[PDB]
RNA sequence: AAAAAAAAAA
RNA sequence: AAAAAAAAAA
RNA sequence: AAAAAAAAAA
RNA sequence: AAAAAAAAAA
RNA sequence: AAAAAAAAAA
RNA sequence: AAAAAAAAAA
RNA sequence: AAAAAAAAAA
RNA sequence: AAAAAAAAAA
RNA sequence: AAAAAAAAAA
RNA sequence: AAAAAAAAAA
RNA sequence: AAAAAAAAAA
RNA sequence: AAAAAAAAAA
RNA sequence: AAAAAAAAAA
RNA sequence: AAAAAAAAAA
């Protein structure tokens, strides 16, 4: 290969964009209480911690969740996800349960193309329920 | 295609990274005086304006430059680029000139693999000379 | 096969080198405190314990890390690695988490060719964060 | 073939560079004392005697060395090279010896792509040891 | 690829040359007056500005010229080149004209093998005529 | 190729070994008196000078020897090797002689698989005889 | 190839001609007034400036014309050609116009074989009309 | 893709 | 169409 | 690549 | 039939 | 196109 | 085996 | 790769 | 090009 | 025969 | 017919 | 990849 | 191996 | 099965 | 015969 700087025969000034889109998998945790659904805000996704504080919208493609602390004594971990949408909330309760008490429960869902519109900080993604006091989510999305 | 949300049969918690790398083409302008070289600082590349303020290092791959204002009366535009490196500056003066007085001059250079190390804000990329008072650069790079 | 000593018809004196290079995977442990990053010194790699005390430089190729003690009560193990470089530090935080509370978390990263320069004892390799009080690293490197 | 001047149908003004790079094999000699290593300075490569006084940086690719005067009485010539690098010196001692007392000893080494960064006059290339009072080097390098 | 220094099994001392030849495209400008031919001296090619001040001879292969300033009001740029040779000057007047008043005129000629002998500083390359006050030349040549 | 750090999806903790074996060609010299056999100790192979002071055992595979100083006036160099073994010494006297007085003599022998057991510092490898006052050995061996 | 003079085994005296024909493209300019056709004389083609002053006849094959100075304010350039012939003039008015105000207009016409007879200095080639005050012609022709 | 100069390689 | 970064997939 | 003009060649 | 110069062409 | 003499070459 | 110089040949 | 001398083998 | 040791990989 | 750099080319 | 040791060979 | 229920399609 | 985002390329 | 380092080989 | 959703399967 070349071991020195070489000239590029540049042409006309190109189309440019200083502030592009970004396809991402974002990991974060939420605290959950027993018997109570937690609504996960979209605003969690915009943070210097993810390099995404310059965005104000996001298109969510899929949501996966894992229990993140141990379950109560005698119990296996479970997590349930209910999709929320601005045009009308769902009533599905997708659920995963652990089969070893020492292991995480997990589940996810995919958002179909027809429901991939933008959401902003004040919108919610899903409701989470669990017997564990924290849940770890990884959300696949398109910042724009 | 699917018109409804569907379940994903998630497995174990994956490897994650909240703060990934990003391959980018960054456009910005510098002011240049007649007969005087301008050293372009790497710090120009870290800005909320580019969504890159969370990074502190960058690996530069190539540099292209265009004149960005009109040249002096009677003259065609020119731009020259001299590569700078922390391990030893170059003395190449890659140059482009316009062939129509109403058109931009342009030139660029590629940095070979052996010289693609990180640079930080206090480092310089290149020296620019021109007969035009501003130069527009587009720098291809890897933020990390 | 031959069962006795046999003659070799040696020729001219060959090129020799009493002190060659060595490609290695080196295992060692570091102690980590909660909430605090630990900077792993390159100096840890030069030791009679690894037969490497005669080297003064090393080129690191990849870094893998495991948690080495159990996590706090109710938690799963995690480990994070942030690459460090003399020419500019990274801000990636590569992370692994366990999915069974009794199991190690692990993660690693590879160093690309353009960043494989020598490091010496006073340099650092990476920052480690964990909720476990010890982390076991295995570093693939070329002593020279 | 053509025996007269002929027209060239020139187009637009091309990209140009008055001060290009140059790939070279540079021959020079150093004086060496018995039992003492000599550090070879990079500055030796920049000289009007090689047409290279306009350069301030160089990328070294390989180093070859020969003994250049006769050895001490009763001895065969030897030469040893230890590579030096700004990011961390090596401890290899690549060695050639003569097999006829009237013949030069020689040896060399190649620098891998990952270590081919620029050096400047104040940097050193390698350490040389020999039982002969002069060593002849040929250095393959890229002036830039 | 190799990431460390490796040995080269050098043989006999090679043929060497500290002061090699160099094939180059040299860009420079000359000032031209209206109605008057400017003889371009070969001495313009030997300069620290081109890294060629150590040469005293050169073999010219081809000459290209562009107008470098705007033409007089109402006119299109033109440039003419007449080849000069120590053994007998030519009377060809190779000519380019612009077809857009804002654009450079250009033309060139090639010297055939039978006329490619050395020239020294006091020799002349060609005569230039133009309606523009500066002409930019690019000369392809073999310094020796 | 990749120009940035990338994640490695590490699994379970691997099998490791901080203190591996090493296959080597070790060069060293012994001083020899006329008419007198010199017994070469295995202990010569364990030294910081070869990076092998952390080993206590070695399996020798082959032995090569060259005369290292000039022979007596009027003579050609010779070297003889007699293999020695803890289970029973040999009486072979493998011998090389020079055919030019200015040139080294050389010879070697290979140890068959059935005799490749470990040796320690107090063991001897071979006896050397020569008309030259130093002999250079290169021993191919497996440190363990 | 041969590097010395060699013999030619010449035969009988050949047919010869001291004054041959010559196929040429001749460039010259004419001044034109607004609203008035200029008749281009064939005599313009016979000149020491073209090396053609020894001819008294020419066979014209084709005529091309370009405007040679800028057009009036607000206008695009145009040029029209009307072919003239000793046996009877044409009334074709072949016309080109510029599509950029800064650019030359051009047009040309070809003379068919049946009309390619000789012309002399007193004959006319074509009529030119333009809104520009000079027109540049290039005439392809056979001097005889 | 082919050619010249410098460098390197089997 | 191939290469690299992030993403997702069989 | 083909054609005209001048040269040269087998 | 191939080369070189000047022209012209797809 | 082959042979001899001088040169050069892979 | 190919090329240049000189010779000779079909 | 093949031949001789000593040994072993299917 | 094949075999050993260490490293890495699908 | 392939790779780098400087030049030239279809 | 293949292998080890010693010698010789292309 | 095949099968059952609901929906749709050529 | 295929698809999407940013990058670079023939 | 492929690559790097050290070793050995035809 | 192919596509979506719920179930079952190798
Ligand atoms: Mg000799
Ligand atoms: Mg225009």
From Swiss-Prot, chains A, B, C, D, E, F, G:
Gene3D superfamilies: Satellite virus coat domain (2.60.120.220). One of its GO terms (cellular component) is viral capsid. Keywords: Capsid protein, Virion. Disulfide bonds: none annotated. The keyword Ion transport does not apply. It comes from the Viruses. Its main location: virion. GO terms for molecular function: structural molecule activity. The keyword Iron does not apply. It is found in: Virion. This virus depends on tobacco mosaic virus for its replication. This is Coat protein. It comes from Satellite tobacco mosaic virus. The lineage of its organism: Viruses, Riboviria, Virtovirus, Tobacco virtovirus 1.
């Amino acid at each position: 290969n070349s071991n020195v700087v070489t000239m590029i025969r540049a042409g006309s000034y190109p189309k440019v964009n200083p502030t592009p889109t970004w396809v991402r998998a974002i990991p974060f945790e939420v605290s959950v209480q027993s018997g109570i659904a937690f609504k996960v805000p979209v605003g969690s996704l915009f943070s210097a911690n993810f390099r995404t504080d310059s965005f104000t919208s996001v298109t969510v493609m899929s949501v996966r969740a894992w229990t993140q602390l141990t379950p109560p004594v005698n119990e296996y971990s479970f997590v349930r996800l209910k999709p929320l949408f601005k045009t009308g909330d769902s009533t599905e309760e997708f659920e995963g349960r652990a089969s070893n008490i020492n292991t995480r429960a997990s589940v996810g869902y995919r958002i179909p193309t027809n429901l991939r519109q933008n959401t902003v900080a004040a919108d919610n993604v899903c409701e989470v329920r669990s017997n564990c006091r924290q849940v770890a989510l990884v959300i696949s999305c398109c910042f724009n």
